[PDB]
Amino acid sequence: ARKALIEKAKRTPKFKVRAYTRCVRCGRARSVYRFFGLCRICLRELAHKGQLPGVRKASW
């Protein structure tokens, strides 16, 4: 239940309640930011890759 997992994650054949997020890449279910539509992990990779506009190493 991982391929059919991610498909059902788009359809919502019923009540808007069963609507849940999903990492666009990894297809993770949890730790997914609404902003990037991505899981925490993959984004860490993209951020390092520079492939994320403005996204930059924070420090204070």
Contact set with RNA (CB under 7 A) = 1-5, 7-8, 11, 13-21, 23, 25-35, 39-42, 44-45, 57, 59-60
Using the rule CB under 5 A, is 6 a contact of Zn ion? no
Strand partners, 32: 39
Tell me if 47 is assigned to a ligand binding site: no
Burial class (CB in 10 A: 0-12, 13-18, 19+), 35: exposed
Using the rule CB under 8 A, is 53 a contact of another protein? yes
Using the rule CB under 5 A, is 32 a contact of Zn ion? no
Tokens found for residue 36: 């990037």
